[PDB]
């Protein structure tokens, strides 16, 4: 598993994921892009997570809550 | 594999698991780093810890790279320029 801090970098893997897992906390949200090779995690502010989640759904990437 | 763990060839590493057990992991020791062909000292840029063979190590950007130290190369070039 790998951690990415930049949203722009993470989206390259997020757009190609088999599934994106969402784990919510009070101050941040973990988004985990499950690719065939690696699980890519990014921590984002909750407002950013909603925007990112909407874009992934619009690109027909599966999003699940864990 | 049990007498193989009685020898000190492998590191005995004690680790606690997420299940609450403390186990011993038997791990390999580091390989020696590349050394200068003249002085035998470790070469700069290549003395990182490596635990298995088959891993490509990048040599410094210099003629003769990870073969001799910069000190040996500079002196040998000074000799050749004159000679």
């Amino acid at each position: 598993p790998k951690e990415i801090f930049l949203v722009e970098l993470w989206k390259k893997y997020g757009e190609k994921a088999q599934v994106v897992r969402v784990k919510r906390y009070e101050d941040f949200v973990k988004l985990k892009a499950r690719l065939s090779g690696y699980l890519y995690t990014i921590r984002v502010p909750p407002d950013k997570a909603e925007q990112l989640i909407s874009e992934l759904k619009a690109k027909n990437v599966k999003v699940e809550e864990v | 594999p049990r007498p193989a763990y009685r020898s000190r060839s492998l590191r005995r590493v004690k680790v606690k698991t997420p299940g609450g057990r403390t186990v011993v992991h038997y791990e390999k020791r580091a390989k020696g780093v590349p050394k200068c062909a003249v002085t035998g000292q470790p070469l700069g840029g290549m003395n990182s810890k490596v635990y298995r063979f088959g891993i490509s190590t990048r040599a410094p950007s210099r003629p003769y790279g990870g073969v001799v130290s910069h000190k040996v190369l500079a002196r040998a070039i000074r000799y050749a320029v004159r000679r």
Binding site: - | A37, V38, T39, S61, R62, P63, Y64, V67, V68, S69, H70, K71, V72, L73, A74, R75, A76, I77, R78, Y79, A80, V81
Partner: protein, 101 residues
Amino acid sequence: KVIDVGRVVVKVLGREAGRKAVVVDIVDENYVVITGPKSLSGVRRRRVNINHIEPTDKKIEIKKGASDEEVLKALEAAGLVEYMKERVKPKLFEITPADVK
């Protein structure tokens, strides 16, 4: 002085070690500007520590702060162009720890 404008040198350290160049400018007691033309020898134009170049007995006549084509025309005047393409080869098997203590 040996390391002067026009003195041909061979860099001994760095990525460009072993390549011939020419001193074109003097900055201070530690640094001179060498540009053994990049298209000719592979040394780009920048300052260099005088401890990282070995002087050669060959010297050319050029002006202070000379440019790359002025250096190029002077090397062919002295007929050293093919000299400035050969890279010095060390003989590592003749070095012993006594020399590099």
